[PDB]
Design a protein around this nucleic acid. Structure first.
Ligand SMILES: [Mg+2]
Ligand SMILES: [Mg+2]
Ligand SMILES: [Mg+2]
Ligand SMILES: [Mg+2]
Ligand SMILES: [Mg+2]
Ligand SMILES: [Mg+2]
Ligand SMILES: [Mg+2]
Ligand SMILES: [Mg+2]
Ligand SMILES: [Mg+2]
Ligand SMILES: [Mg+2]
Ligand SMILES: [Mg+2]
Ligand SMILES: [Mg+2]
Ligand SMILES: [Mg+2]
Ligand SMILES: [Mg+2]
Ligand SMILES: [Mg+2]
Ligand SMILES: [Mg+2]
Ligand SMILES: [Mg+2]
Ligand SMILES: [Mg+2]
Ligand SMILES: [Mg+2]
Ligand SMILES: [Mg+2]
Ligand SMILES: [Mg+2]
Ligand SMILES: [Mg+2]
Ligand SMILES: [Mg+2]
Ligand SMILES: [Mg+2]
Ligand SMILES: [Mg+2]
Ligand SMILES: [Mg+2]
Ligand SMILES: [Mg+2]
Ligand SMILES: [Mg+2]
Ligand SMILES: [Mg+2]
Ligand SMILES: [Mg+2]
Ligand SMILES: [Mg+2]
Ligand SMILES: [Mg+2]
Ligand SMILES: [Mg+2]
Ligand SMILES: [Mg+2]
Ligand SMILES: [Mg+2]
Ligand SMILES: [Mg+2]
Ligand SMILES: [Mg+2]
Ligand SMILES: [Mg+2]
Ligand SMILES: [Mg+2]
Ligand SMILES: [Mg+2]
Ligand SMILES: [Mg+2]
Ligand SMILES: [Mg+2]
Ligand SMILES: [Mg+2]
Ligand SMILES: [Mg+2]
Ligand SMILES: [Mg+2]
Ligand SMILES: [Mg+2]
Ligand SMILES: [Mg+2]
Ligand SMILES: [Mg+2]
Ligand SMILES: [Mg+2]
Ligand SMILES: [Mg+2]
Ligand SMILES: [Mg+2]
Ligand SMILES: [Mg+2]
Ligand SMILES: [Mg+2]
Ligand SMILES: [Mg+2]
Ligand SMILES: [Mg+2]
Ligand SMILES: [Mg+2]
Ligand SMILES: [Mg+2]
Ligand SMILES: [Mg+2]
Ligand SMILES: [Mg+2]
Ligand SMILES: [Mg+2]
Ligand SMILES: [Mg+2]
Ligand SMILES: [Mg+2]
Ligand SMILES: [Mg+2]
Ligand SMILES: [Mg+2]
Ligand SMILES: [Mg+2]
Ligand SMILES: [Mg+2]
Ligand SMILES: [Mg+2]
Ligand SMILES: [Mg+2]
Ligand SMILES: [Mg+2]
Ligand SMILES: [Mg+2]
Ligand SMILES: [Mg+2]
Ligand SMILES: [Mg+2]
Ligand SMILES: [Mg+2]
Ligand SMILES: [Mg+2]
Ligand SMILES: [Mg+2]
Ligand SMILES: [Mg+2]
Ligand SMILES: [Mg+2]
Ligand SMILES: [Mg+2]
Ligand SMILES: [Mg+2]
Ligand SMILES: [Mg+2]
Ligand SMILES: [Mg+2]
Ligand SMILES: [Mg+2]
Ligand SMILES: [Mg+2]
Ligand SMILES: [Mg+2]
Ligand SMILES: [Mg+2]
Ligand SMILES: [Mg+2]
Ligand SMILES: [Mg+2]
Ligand SMILES: [Mg+2]
Ligand SMILES: [Mg+2]
Ligand SMILES: [Mg+2]
Ligand SMILES: [Mg+2]
Ligand SMILES: [Mg+2]
Ligand SMILES: [Mg+2]
Ligand SMILES: [Mg+2]
Ligand SMILES: [Mg+2]
Ligand SMILES: [Mg+2]
Ligand SMILES: [Mg+2]
Ligand SMILES: [Mg+2]
Ligand SMILES: [Mg+2]
Ligand SMILES: [Mg+2]
Ligand SMILES: [Mg+2]
Ligand SMILES: [Mg+2]
Ligand SMILES: [Mg+2]
Ligand SMILES: [Mg+2]
Ligand SMILES: [Mg+2]
Ligand SMILES: [Mg+2]
Ligand SMILES: [Mg+2]
Ligand SMILES: [Mg+2]
Ligand SMILES: [Mg+2]
Ligand SMILES: [Mg+2]
Ligand SMILES: [Mg+2]
Ligand SMILES: [Mg+2]
Ligand SMILES: [Mg+2]
Ligand SMILES: [Mg+2]
Ligand SMILES: [Mg+2]
Ligand SMILES: [Mg+2]
Ligand SMILES: [Mg+2]
Ligand SMILES: [Mg+2]
Ligand SMILES: [Mg+2]
Ligand SMILES: [Mg+2]
Ligand SMILES: [Mg+2]
Ligand SMILES: [Mg+2]
Ligand SMILES: [Mg+2]
Ligand SMILES: [Mg+2]
Ligand SMILES: [Mg+2]
Ligand SMILES: [Mg+2]
Ligand SMILES: [Mg+2]
Ligand SMILES: [Mg+2]
Ligand SMILES: [Mg+2]
Ligand SMILES: [Mg+2]
Ligand SMILES: [Mg+2]
Ligand SMILES: [Mg+2]
Ligand SMILES: [Mg+2]
Ligand SMILES: [Mg+2]
Ligand SMILES: [Mg+2]
Ligand SMILES: [Mg+2]
Ligand SMILES: [Mg+2]
Ligand SMILES: [Mg+2]
Ligand SMILES: [Mg+2]
Ligand SMILES: [Mg+2]
Ligand SMILES: [Mg+2]
Ligand SMILES: [Mg+2]
Ligand SMILES: [Mg+2]
Ligand SMILES: [Mg+2]
Ligand SMILES: [Mg+2]
Ligand SMILES: [Mg+2]
Ligand SMILES: [Mg+2]
Ligand SMILES: [Mg+2]
Ligand SMILES: [Mg+2]
Ligand SMILES: [Mg+2]
Ligand SMILES: [Mg+2]
Ligand SMILES: [Mg+2]
Ligand SMILES: [Mg+2]
Ligand SMILES: [Mg+2]
Ligand SMILES: [Mg+2]
Ligand SMILES: [Mg+2]
Ligand SMILES: [Mg+2]
Ligand SMILES: [Mg+2]
Ligand SMILES: [Mg+2]
Ligand SMILES: [Mg+2]
Ligand SMILES: [Mg+2]
Lengths: 188, 76, 59, 136
RNA sequence: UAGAGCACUGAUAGGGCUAGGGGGCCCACCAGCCUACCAAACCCUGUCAAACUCCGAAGGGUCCCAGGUGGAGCCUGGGAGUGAGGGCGCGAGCGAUAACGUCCGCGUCCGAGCGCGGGAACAACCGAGACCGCCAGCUAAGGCCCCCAAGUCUGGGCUAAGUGGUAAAGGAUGUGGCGCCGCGAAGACAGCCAGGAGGUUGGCUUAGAAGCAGCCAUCCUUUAAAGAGUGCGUAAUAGCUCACUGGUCGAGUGGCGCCGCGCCGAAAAUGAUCGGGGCUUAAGCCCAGCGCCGAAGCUGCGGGUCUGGGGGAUGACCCCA
RNA sequence: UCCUAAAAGGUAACGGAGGCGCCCAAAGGUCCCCUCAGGCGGGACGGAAAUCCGCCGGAGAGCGCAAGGGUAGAAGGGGGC
RNA sequence: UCAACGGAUAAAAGUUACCCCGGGGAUAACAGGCUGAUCUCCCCCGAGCGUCCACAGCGGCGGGGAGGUUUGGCACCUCGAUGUCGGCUCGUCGCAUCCUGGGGCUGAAGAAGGUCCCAAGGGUUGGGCUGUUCGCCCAUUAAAGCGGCACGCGAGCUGGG
RNA sequence: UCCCCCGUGCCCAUAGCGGCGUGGAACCACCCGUUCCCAUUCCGAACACGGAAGUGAAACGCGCCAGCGCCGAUGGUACUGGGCGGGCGACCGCCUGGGAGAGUAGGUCGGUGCGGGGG
């Protein structure tokens, strides 16, 4: 994706938002530059892009930088993005959160279970060239009460699980209405 | 009820500060345990009271593991 | 340390004691009173902490 | 719970840490005003929620009361209150995420969270999901 | 400390791991397996704490140096009074995140400034510290249509309730304004015209269950369109409707989010009201600008008194702040 | 003793929560020496826990007695005088 | 255990409706007031009941509020005095209406009724028991309303409490 | 000047743990032995003494590697002396000066003083 990023300097970060620009900074292992983008633009761009793909930032300098939001500071008091980071890549293997597509028909659904998920995006080390839109999650033969772990992952080549090879990925917990309530009020 | 109790203020802590003139025997700092260790021309007693053994200025010196020592630099 | 004209315009009555005292080190008796002290880092401080009571003038 | 008897009042300053993000589930319920949420309130919204969509998925209740609600039994000033009458509450300031459902339909969610909102004293909002987490 | 954090001290929502306890398989040879159960220690997600703190501000205290001549300070001594305080803002306990409630703290006014202007009136809210005079002059707060001093000022928006004249969860095609997305002159929205078929009475269930009590499963054909079917309805059927397609039709149309102001929610006791009259492109609210009224504050003139400075055989008196 | 106490000190309420009215001639003084709790693994009675062995284990023990603070680079454990 | 721990004597309890003096609204009881926890009523959400159908009628779990009658909290005016129940007498005001008036819905055939809205102008009984308010009861009634006025009224009365 | 090593002190984790490598002529430790000084509530393991042979295994020195630990921006943000405004209240906002924590990029498996021995 793209985004017309501008250079900052002595602008009021607070009064800046009032205008309509989203404060933030782009930087890598050798970079550190005050910048800012447009609220409306970044809004619709980040909706799709999010923090899994790479968003090139077109500075007035004409520099097309392979950046991805390393971090977002969300304003409390009615959610809304305040600040944004933009970590630029190069040719060195970089870590990041990669999407996970839970595809299949869990045995829980059949027995009237609950679609549980934990890591909708795992942190993994990978080269800048590899941009796997997502990883096929074989969640299907998973019955109610069973769990798929990080050590049970199918990793696309050139990638490693930069986590703790035993980290929960998903589950299948039970429903809850009648039985629980009626029995809880009397057994609590 | 039964709670309204409390031993009056003992008023401890830092009595003298770095960059202060001191005679000989001035109670530098009265402390609980040993939050401040002695040092150059400074000794303590039973209640861990810190005082000057010479005449000069008070100085502090934080030394992580070792501790937060405090001394006095004699001059006249 | 060019001159510093200062005119008392906002009564200190009802304001913190320290501020009252500031108009003493600066020496401001009544209202609408002129006062052209020097521009020393010290004297500045006072004028500053009471700026909302006196309109400074760079002379 | 388990710690010790009573606790202070303490004001409810800015809606700072009282406010998070949708960490689990799909939809979420956020507070707009600050106040103490009562145990009866949690359950009230709980039962209301789960009861709405019979055989519902998984209902996440992020908040959790632990503040001994103090109170006196219609008398005067002989020491500190017995409290415990209403039970306990939780420091709920604007932005917080009291509840959040999952594995269910959006319609089920929207209506439920709505009803459970009335079970709450604070005016509330319903946030989707987006992608606002913390990554790259 | 604020905050912040969970590294200790405790709480804790979910999940994994897994000791221990329950249940089932099964033979007592005493183990082995499963468990949409209770759950220790450990890990991940996530969070709470005055008496928890890995961390940690603004700030406050203090000593040296510098400005600071002030009804500043320090020393010795004489003479006191005071030892119910209160309101207010802020930070806390108690209280019920009650009280013209109460208990400390930081400051402030009233006290003793019930002296003056404003606030309708009103010890403490806003303005401002009254030595005396004056039929002078600018301004402060507030205010500038009439009671009332001074604009029915100027320009640009909002609000049709008299809102303004000031109550909540919650409710609402009120009305205006900004952004995103669907659909549309290759013919859209709506009304309107007709159709909206079979297997199938989807499986099951049930007395029945035929799209439409309920459960679960979760096709094919014809075609421009018709759904293993949305509601009303029947005992179950029928019958109507809708999404859908074509004709009509002719220009827009639909949804979401955010914002301004108003509407409902709104029931009290001697007569009624925003202080009153009365006000609607304002005499309401928001925004930007000029002008003016207005205090015992300031300036102007004159005068008293006290303190300090100067002329000064001159004590004296004169002038100045 | 701690919190309340608003980062110096101090600071109130019939505010929250807990102690003291002692004990020790060795639990002191000096000298020299010594290092915890637990966890795991291994072992006759024991076997959650006596005692012994190996590795890990910086202070979560110990420090007479409540708590706070301090503390093994000793205030702790032992012996001589 | 001068432990009331700055310790009046070496040596000390209780009673007064037989009571008194000094003083306080610095302080309780009555009333007012501020508040609204308690009380009355209204309202949002709506599991669920009502064959069927959540809104004829009804409402869990929980949330908002109005009033200012009760109990209650505070101790602000009044302790050189604000008379305190009930009754009687005279009333007057509110509306959240008991009746009569009108109206909507109905699980409204009709009659009768249920519930909600509008609506004080007027009306809203005699008696038994108790100091009672309150309430129970008899007989009737179109109905036998709730509440404010220092729970109106002792310089109008009563004095059973 | 400079290098390797020995003693000792400072900075007090960017020097710690851990896996790998590496040095013994010199320096260091282990090592031989327990007669004498002296010792383990049992042991020469520890402390101690006399001193050749052997190794660099243990310990340590040096170097490497980042998995753990640790150090940590910047940017913005919370909060806040000070000044001001708005709401019934719970609370909210602006100007002025100050400005964390957490998370991100990232840094580090040491640096340094005096003296002593050896080239
Ligand atoms: Mg553009
Ligand atoms: Mg006390
Ligand atoms: Mg006391
Ligand atoms: Mg005290
Ligand atoms: Mg005392
Ligand atoms: Mg004053
Ligand atoms: Mg100061
Ligand atoms: Mg428990
Ligand atoms: Mg708070
Ligand atoms: Mg409740
Ligand atoms: Mg609500
Ligand atoms: Mg409540
Ligand atoms: Mg809502
Ligand atoms: Mg605090
Ligand atoms: Mg704290
Ligand atoms: Mg905090
Ligand atoms: Mg943590
Ligand atoms: Mg414990
Ligand atoms: Mg647990
Ligand atoms: Mg848990
Ligand atoms: Mg077991
Ligand atoms: Mg068993
Ligand atoms: Mg057999
Ligand atoms: Mg057996
Ligand atoms: Mg046997
Ligand atoms: Mg067997
Ligand atoms: Mg645990
Ligand atoms: Mg996190
Ligand atoms: Mg929690
Ligand atoms: Mg200073
Ligand atoms: Mg000097
Ligand atoms: Mg000098
Ligand atoms: Mg000097
Ligand atoms: Mg000086
Ligand atoms: Mg002078
Ligand atoms: Mg004076
Ligand atoms: Mg004076
Ligand atoms: Mg005197
Ligand atoms: Mg006294
Ligand atoms: Mg308070
Ligand atoms: Mg009082
Ligand atoms: Mg008071
Ligand atoms: Mg005061
Ligand atoms: Mg005065
Ligand atoms: Mg005064
Ligand atoms: Mg005064
Ligand atoms: Mg008078
Ligand atoms: Mg006035
Ligand atoms: Mg006045
Ligand atoms: Mg005059
Ligand atoms: Mg004028
Ligand atoms: Mg004005
Ligand atoms: Mg006027
Ligand atoms: Mg206009
Ligand atoms: Mg009106
Ligand atoms: Mg709509
Ligand atoms: Mg056409
Ligand atoms: Mg149409
Ligand atoms: Mg239509
Ligand atoms: Mg047929
Ligand atoms: Mg059938
Ligand atoms: Mg009415
Ligand atoms: Mg009237
Ligand atoms: Mg007015
Ligand atoms: Mg103007
Ligand atoms: Mg004037
Ligand atoms: Mg004058
Ligand atoms: Mg003049
Ligand atoms: Mg002049
Ligand atoms: Mg002379
Ligand atoms: Mg002279
Ligand atoms: Mg003279
Ligand atoms: Mg403190
Ligand atoms: Mg303090
Ligand atoms: Mg308390
Ligand atoms: Mg003894
Ligand atoms: Mg000893
Ligand atoms: Mg000893
Ligand atoms: Mg030993
Ligand atoms: Mg052990
Ligand atoms: Mg074992
Ligand atoms: Mg073992
Ligand atoms: Mg063992
Ligand atoms: Mg035996
Ligand atoms: Mg054992
Ligand atoms: Mg064992
Ligand atoms: Mg064991
Ligand atoms: Mg000792
Ligand atoms: Mg010893
Ligand atoms: Mg000894
Ligand atoms: Mg006694
Ligand atoms: Mg005596
Ligand atoms: Mg006494
Ligand atoms: Mg006595
Ligand atoms: Mg006595
Ligand atoms: Mg006695
Ligand atoms: Mg008698
Ligand atoms: Mg007599
Ligand atoms: Mg008698
Ligand atoms: Mg008397
Ligand atoms: Mg009374
Ligand atoms: Mg009273
Ligand atoms: Mg009165
Ligand atoms: Mg109320
Ligand atoms: Mg209502
Ligand atoms: Mg009702
Ligand atoms: Mg009920
Ligand atoms: Mg119940
Ligand atoms: Mg209940
Ligand atoms: Mg209720
Ligand atoms: Mg409630
Ligand atoms: Mg209520
Ligand atoms: Mg209320
Ligand atoms: Mg009362
Ligand atoms: Mg009083
Ligand atoms: Mg009297
Ligand atoms: Mg009189
Ligand atoms: Mg009288
Ligand atoms: Mg009188
Ligand atoms: Mg009459
Ligand atoms: Mg009728
Ligand atoms: Mg009717
Ligand atoms: Mg009819
Ligand atoms: Mg009938
Ligand atoms: Mg009449
Ligand atoms: Mg009678
Ligand atoms: Mg009779
Ligand atoms: Mg009779
Ligand atoms: Mg009678
Ligand atoms: Mg009677
Ligand atoms: Mg009765
Ligand atoms: Mg009868
Ligand atoms: Mg009446
Ligand atoms: Mg009466
Ligand atoms: Mg009477
Ligand atoms: Mg009478
Ligand atoms: Mg009477
Ligand atoms: Mg009378
Ligand atoms: Mg008589
Ligand atoms: Mg009698
Ligand atoms: Mg009698
Ligand atoms: Mg080797
Ligand atoms: Mg080698
Ligand atoms: Mg021997
Ligand atoms: Mg020999
Ligand atoms: Mg011998
Ligand atoms: Mg031997
Ligand atoms: Mg040896
Ligand atoms: Mg020999
Ligand atoms: Mg050799
Ligand atoms: Mg060798
Ligand atoms: Mg080696
Ligand atoms: Mg070295
Ligand atoms: Mg950091
Ligand atoms: Mg940082
Ligand atoms: Mg990195
Ligand atoms: Mg890192
Ligand atoms: Mg190394
Ligand atoms: Mg060196
Ligand atoms: Mg060489
Ligand atoms: Mg050479």
């Amino acid at each position: 994706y793209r985004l017309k990023a501008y250079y900052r300097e002595g602008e009021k970060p607070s009064a800046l938002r009032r205008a309509g620009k989203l404060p933030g900074v782009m930087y890598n292992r050798h970079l550190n530059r005050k910048v800012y983008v447009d609220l409306v633009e970044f809004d619709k761009v980040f909706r799709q892009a999010s923090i899994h793909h790479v968003i090139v930032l077109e500075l007035p300098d004409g520099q097309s930088l392979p950046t991805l939001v390393r971090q977002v500071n969300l304003d409390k008091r009615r959610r809304r993005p305040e600040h944004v980071d933009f970590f630029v890549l190069s040719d060195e293997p970089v870590e990041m959160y990669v999407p996970l597509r839970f595809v299949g028909t869990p045995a829980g659904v059949r027995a009237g279970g609950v679609l549980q998920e934990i890591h909708r995006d795992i942190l993994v080390k990978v080269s800048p060239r590899n941009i796997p839109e997502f990883i096929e999650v074989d969640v299907s033969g998973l019955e109610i009460g069973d769990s798929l772990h990080a050590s049970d992952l199918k990793l696309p080549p050139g990638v490693e699980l930069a986590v703790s090879p035993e980290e929960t990925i998903a589950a299948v917990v039970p429903p809850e209405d009648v039985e629980k309530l009626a029995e809880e009020a009397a057994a609590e | 009820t039964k709670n309204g109790r409390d031993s009056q203020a003992k008023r401890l802590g830092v009595k003298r500060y770095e960059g202060q003139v001191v005679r000989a025997g001035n109670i530098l700092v009265r402390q609980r345990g040993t939050r401040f260790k002695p040092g150059k021309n400074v000794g303590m007693g039973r209640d861990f009271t810190l005082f000057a053994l010479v005449d000069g200025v008070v100085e502090f010196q934080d030394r992580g593991r070792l501790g937060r020592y405090v001394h006095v630099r004699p001059l006249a | 340390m060019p001159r510093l004209k200062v005119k008392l315009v906002k009564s200190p009555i009802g304001y913190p004691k320290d501020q009252k005292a500031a108009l003493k080190a600066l020496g401001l008796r009544r209202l609408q009173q002129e006062r052209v002290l020097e521009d020393t880092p010290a004297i500045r401080g006072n004028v500053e902490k009471v700026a909302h009571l006196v309109r400074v003038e760079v002379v | 719970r388990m710690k010790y008897r009573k606790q202070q009042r303490g004001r409810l300053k800015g809606a700072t840490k009282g406010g998070d993000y949708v960490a689990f589930g799909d939809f979420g319920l956020v507070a707009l005003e600050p106040a103490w949420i009562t145990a009866q309130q949690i359950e009230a919204a709980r039962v209301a929620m789960v009861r709405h969509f019979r055989r519902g998925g998984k209902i996440f209740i992020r908040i959790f009361p632990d503040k001994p609600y103090t109170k006196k039994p219609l008398e005067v000033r002989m020491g500190k209150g017995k409290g415990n009458v209403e039970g306990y509450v939780a420091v709920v300031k604007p932005g917080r995420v009291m509840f959040e459902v999952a594995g269910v339909t959006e319609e089920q969610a929207m209506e439920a969270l709505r009803i459970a909102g009335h079970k709450l004293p604070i005016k509330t909002k319903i946030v989707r999901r987006d992608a606002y987490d913390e990554a790259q």
